[PDB]
Amino acid sequence: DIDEGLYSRQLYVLGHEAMKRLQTSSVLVSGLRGLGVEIAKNIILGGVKAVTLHDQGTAQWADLSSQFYLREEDIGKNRAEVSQPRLAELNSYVPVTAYTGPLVEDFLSGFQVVVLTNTPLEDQLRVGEFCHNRGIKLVVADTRGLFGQLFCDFGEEMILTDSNGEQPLSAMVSMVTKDNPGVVTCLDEARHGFESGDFVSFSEVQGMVELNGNQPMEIKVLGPYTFSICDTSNFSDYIRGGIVSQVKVPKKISFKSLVASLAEPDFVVTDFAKFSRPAQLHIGFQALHQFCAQHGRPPRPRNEEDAAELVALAQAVNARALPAVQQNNLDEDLIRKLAYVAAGDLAPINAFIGGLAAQEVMKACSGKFMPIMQWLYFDALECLPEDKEVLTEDKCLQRQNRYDGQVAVFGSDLQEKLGKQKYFLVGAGAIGCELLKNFAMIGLGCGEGGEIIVTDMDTIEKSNLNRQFLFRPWDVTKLKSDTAAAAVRQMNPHIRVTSHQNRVGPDTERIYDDDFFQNLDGVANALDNVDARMYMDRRCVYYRKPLLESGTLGTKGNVQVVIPFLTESYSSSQDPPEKSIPIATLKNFPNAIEHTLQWARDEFEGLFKQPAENVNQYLTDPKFVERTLRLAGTQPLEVLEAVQRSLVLQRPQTWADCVTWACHHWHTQYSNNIRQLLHNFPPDQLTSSGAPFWSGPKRCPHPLTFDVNNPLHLDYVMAAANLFAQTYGLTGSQDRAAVATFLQSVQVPEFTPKSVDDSRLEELKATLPSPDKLPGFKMYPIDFEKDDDSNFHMDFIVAASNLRAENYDIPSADRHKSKLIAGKIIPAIATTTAAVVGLVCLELYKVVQGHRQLDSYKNGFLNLALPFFGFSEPLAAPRHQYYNQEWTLWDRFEVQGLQPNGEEMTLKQFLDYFKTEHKLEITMLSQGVSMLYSFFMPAAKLKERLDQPMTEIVSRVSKRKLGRHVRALVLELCCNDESGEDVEVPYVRYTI
Template sequence: MAKEKAASVNIMDNDINEEVLRKFSYMVSGDTCPMNAVIGGIVAQEVLKASSGKFTPIFQWLYFDAVECLPAVRNPEAENYEMNESRYDSQIALFGKQFQEKLGDLKYFIVGAGAIGCELLKNFAMMGVGAGSGSVTVTDMDLIEKSNLNRQFLFRPWDVQQPKSTVAAKAVKAMNPKINVVAHENRVGTETEKVYNDAFFENLDGVANALDNVDARIYMDRRCVYYRKPLLESGTLGTKGNTQVVVPHITESYSSSQDPPEKSIPICTLKNFPYAIEHTLQWARDTFEGVFRQAASNAAQYLTEPAFMERILKLPGCQPVETLESVKRALVDDFPTGFEDCIKWARNQWEDHYNNQIRQLLFNFPPDQITTSGQPFWSGPKRCPVPLTFDIKNPLHIDYIVAAANLKAEVYGIVQNRNRDFITDVVSKVEVPPFTPKCGIKIAVTDAEAQSASGNVDHDRLQYLQKLLPSPSQLKDLVIKPLEFEKDDDNNFHMDFIVAASNLRAENYKIPIADRHKSKLIAGKIIPAIATTTSVVSGLVCLELIKLAQGHRNLDVYKNGFVNLALPFFGFSEPLPAPRQRFYDFEWTLWDRFEVKGEMTLQEFIDHFKNEYKLEITMLSQGVCMLYSFFMPPAKRNERMQL
């Protein structure tokens, strides 16, 4: 029939690929959720482009296929593909009943129940993964925030502040009651290895990451390599997304390649020479971390950890002095006994940051300063700052005092006060010490100068600080609470402080200020997640899952994906093979390891490697414990050889 139709439109027989036609005829009634997710996400983004006028639409045609997912050899038994009014009929038409049963028997671990995690859970439920004798375990320690609702579609407004994993599991269970989904609320890491132990991983068929940070990805990658389990990796960044499939013994691991480091703002730009609102916001974030988290954490550890001082004194460079200075400020200089003390502290902080430090900077580098090359010092990206004068009638000035005072109170367990009139009245009575710029204060102009200065150790100052600090026993009833920055809580004063602190510094340097929304995006490092991108990425991941479930061992079957729906760009590549190394006549990859079975002494263990592999062990350790090394005292080494 195809040949007759081709002949009618003057297509020659040799232009017809009969194998493709045959496959198409078999699969024409079939359908699968991952392909729908990919195409649906792309189409939805095109609709957004048409309605918003943003980004570049697809020009003419986009061709996408995943023929590698189809069975290499089709089961000749027709009943294997018969439809029986099952929810999986369209998928059975593609892969057969036997494969559908295999999907149901899979045991997968989804790490993360955020945007991608929700999409993966939905796809798994629609495909029937874990809906037989298998299961899907999902873990996420986060609670649902209001800002999650625009893209994490399994959640509803009434789910806010509920565990993500539990709510997501319940939602997909409603979609497919037969899916066996288990929800955990654990962080993956060394602290939960008693939960995700040998028995847990050895029982898995694979892991799908839906994480939002590199450290957790690397940790899960190490675990998958150790247990030789497939890993489906994915990530999104606005309209950009990528997927990676890691297959034991075939491909490289996630950690085998690294992304280039993120561009960071030079320290000196942040501290003294900002010229963009991004710089002032990062400075405000650093101030929050330094004052309300790190300094509070140092003070709390000083009060509760007997070995704190011993540990701190071993730190390199000027870190011991800086740490003890922060403890001194927290427990001596700036220690509040009531909320009015917090207001007084906030007023002095304002004066120090926005007046005194700027005056000192201008004392060191006057507005008319000329460099050795004859150019004005304050030129190019360097903006000449102006000190601010505190104005009790300026709402921005009071915003800073209100936020800083309340955060200080929270750190020390003091009852907070949101009454602006009360705070304004108290702050108007605060006497601020006069400031005179000092000679001999060196201000680093480059990061190299700052790094050089940080290596100097003032031993006299270090000893003085140790004597000055109160004994922990004197403050045994004091509880100090370090604050973790949380951008999504509008009532915790965190973003109030960031916005006020940043905009005041922007006024110092004549930088246009930013409203709360823009400040939140930048300071919270928010790149808006888009449901279209997560749909495409999760669909691509699940297409690779189909290949893994079929047991493909050829590298060219698998595909890593790279998409940018804005451009639009769609790129796919074969995963890189696991790098091969050699020693003597042995060849190995990261998936290989030495397996030694049975009871033996340390001497027998060392002899085994020498005799079997011609390798001499010079050091042997377990975790942080060294069991053997060539430089051990002979008596101790000989004793351990018999263990």
């Protein structure tokens, strides 16, 4: 009953069960400041039952530095009333309401979760006692400039169905013992990965029927391949085979009251370098609430006496605490830094904690992740200028400007820098929208000499609306970049955003040429693949521009910053590759559902798109036959045969001819090939070790007969015949009754499994119909589309995967799970996306101010399902050395290509230049993939290259002349130094 089209990317992070528990949960958001609107944004996008806003204060100027829904013409009104229609637009399924002041006990009764933001502590204590004693989930989140806190109180009895968010792992059973604590041994080359205390379940274990289908039993990890189970004394005798399935059991946790947790705090560390800070910041926020009782206002920005008042108050709060919470040492400077940025309201900090606080609300009414227990304190104190002595009398003083909440922390001069920044945003997806929103609130590119370049090739799909809040369901079929700019120009009219629709890569080097990266001050990535990340990384090294890299995956996030001449690049480190299924266990011996889904996706590409693309190239390119005959072995015959099939053999003319093909391919793929496989490998053949072949990762298949009444057999023919007719351009019907009536009249050719090659190829080149014989005929390839439930695409994969799963006795999967593996959908949620982008813009405050110390930067790593928060300083760029000169990744060789005379530098002058000016005996020279010079060159190759200029050599080997736009050239070297032996050296910028 839930809209899988809208929540597609989110149902892969919460699941249908936890989503249904969201549909029936009302949330109250109190305080619509910068932090309050951020929390409410992700909650509405998450899909709760209903959200209710609440606020008593007016929309002051100091609130526009982070609230992206308070326009400049709404100052003075009620924040909850004006931002209600804007928040109610994000999700057409969640009604949003506001309230105008009373926080009475009867009002809180109609809510399940209550969020308290920017509310005095004494006013929070009354709400905390009531909600906990009546079973109302409580979330308290406050942000004070660079600092911020987050608190949760989900009652003293909360059931957790999932405490880590990770999918259950599986393993295959080798041997199990009949001891009192039975010992299970997994297969070799496949670690179980389980933990002591986990619960597993057994299946397909023959010889111990009592162990199969049992309920969760505790396990103890005895090693990387063994673990123990329950009692196995009075069980049967084990034989062979089996599969272990990890199961997560629901466990209960308890939360203390707000008034009790404030006295007995349980902390969750955000920065492990700041381990002793959550205890100190717990006293600072209490003194900040009591500060509003002495002076009736937040402390003034910077200032000396107002900072000394918090130090005097914090010492009194420390003495009045319990003798286990009282700290023997008080950090005077940390509380004085808190008084300076107390009156500040920054968009990044609000976006970060607002993303976390919104995620805690998701855990409250779903029990899907481990919540924060119970306090979470975070500070971005490194964003301040390094030791710089700036006065508050000119800068931090409020100017009745929209940036008062941000200038009060940094200053007017640091605000003028942002207005003159030019940044390049690569992508307008989930991270792209959050960055444009923070750009508008921060103020970067909002001046006379500032610009924000947004480029993105994708159009707005229905699934994007769950996390990309700058888009609306009527913005479908529009460019993301153009639409996202129009949404930001309304949040801040001063911003200047240019929206391109160019796919960033090697083809668009003309648009983003050398002159483009010159006036840039930095680049911010928002990409969903690793190839574009590596491409943007190499260019930021060639042009020496800062890069802000970020990535998400479900509840996980990471942030890495690359500063020129300071840190290593994104490509310096390596990441583990994706799950690569061996071709053997993919084509013949599958064991999991992923092996059939990956097989069904390859069936779609090779059965519909691949033959049509070959026929079109055969009918368009006159040099197609010669091209295919040139490449590889047993590949010309595979492609030439496919052309003969699609042109004459398997060529349809009527819809009925497509139904017979779908029935013939069914018997060939799920019956004939299965009998052919069983012929080469009988169902009880032994291996070289005398062991049964069909054991463990190899499941014994069985042929499948065609039953016209079975819907799974019919669902396959309907989707196959339609996609087959679309390839040839024929009208396909959807009447499942007439097709089934027609299937009972189709004849299937007999099949008997079976136990110079160029001579067959010499006949095919002569038997192929000439393109002049049939003029007019053309086929149409079919691009795979996952998010369309009408093109029969997912209808084919599910039917193709589950039919193969029945052959190998594999449990099938629904079309929702099949869409995850075959479509390769990466799960994403709005709370994680907003959390990392807030951390990205924190380091952005350091880039625009120019930090040269590695201590100031922080690389972020998040996992909101644990919850985990870790930060580490970026690694300094690796320093290598050849003889007396040492070089860094950011260093280059500058070689002027053309000379005192108009002629170009030659290869000989190039080699001798490094021997006399740099003392480098060059022994290997290459530009890209082509090699130019090496010590092992043939004598003839060296003669015809020494006197030729460098551009003439590259164009000679690369078969492509250099374009007119090429202004410089990158060269790789492997030379010998003055020491004696081979040595690596920087690259060369060869300016033409």
